[PDB]
Design an enzyme around this catalytic site. Sequence first.
Site, short mmCIF file in Angstrom:
data_model
loop_
_atom_site.label_atom_id
_atom_site.label_comp_id
_atom_site.label_asym_id
_atom_site.label_seq_id
_atom_site.Cartn_x
_atom_site.Cartn_y
_atom_site.Cartn_z
N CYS A 121 1.98 2.44 10.08
CA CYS A 121 2.14 1.28 9.20
C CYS A 121 3.48 1.32 8.48
CB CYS A 121 0.93 1.07 8.26
SG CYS A 121 0.55 2.44 7.14
N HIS A 164 0.83 -1.20 0.00
CA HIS A 164 0.00 0.00 0.00
C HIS A 164 0.87 1.26 0.00
CE1 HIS A 164 0.47 -0.75 4.40
NE2 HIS A 164 0.42 0.58 4.56
N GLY A 172 -0.16 6.01 9.87
CA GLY A 172 1.15 6.60 10.09
C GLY A 172 2.12 5.64 10.76
N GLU A 217 0.94 -8.81 1.28
CA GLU A 217 1.17 -7.37 1.45
C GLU A 217 2.64 -6.98 1.60
OE1 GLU A 217 -1.12 -4.89 1.08
OE2 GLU A 217 0.58 -3.53 1.39
#
Lengths: 182, 6
Positions: free
Chosen positions: A146, A40, A144, A71
Amino acid sequence: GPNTEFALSLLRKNIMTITTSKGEFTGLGIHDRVCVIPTHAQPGDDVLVNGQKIRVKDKYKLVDPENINLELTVLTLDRNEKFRDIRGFISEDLEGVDATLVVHSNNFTNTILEVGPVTMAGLINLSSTPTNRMIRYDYATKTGQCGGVLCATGKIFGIHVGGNGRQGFSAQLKKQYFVEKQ
Amino acid sequence: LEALFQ
């Protein structure tokens, strides 16, 4: 203590701010020239590692064996300053129900946040995107954080990927997925 | 859970 020692050590040795499309993220160098960064985060063709504009050598979005998002964007760069092999600390068996989050991302760069009790949620949706091997820790966290490294002295659990309510969610970086790669 | 990216 030794736990915070490991955290502050890992941070300075293999952690570096990788600035990309979604901003600054915690670049967790696994070994040699390979580092992991959230998907992401939107890593592109060129990223700013500590301000140094480096082009991508190989960007592999690591998905789970059950062909679901894991991910972890395996960001391989032709890294001059090779990363130390912290892959030995990356565990498949965590056994570290006590973890510390080292945030080195957009909202908190160089921020050691002990999360306390860490467990796993198995399989869930992450930003409406089904993601496998999700870690759950009862510790209120927000955007923030992550990209942050979830670790303990001797055990790297993975990286903070998101959160749901008051429970933070990380991706479980099982040794199995990295020890096999070369 | 539908946890969000952070």
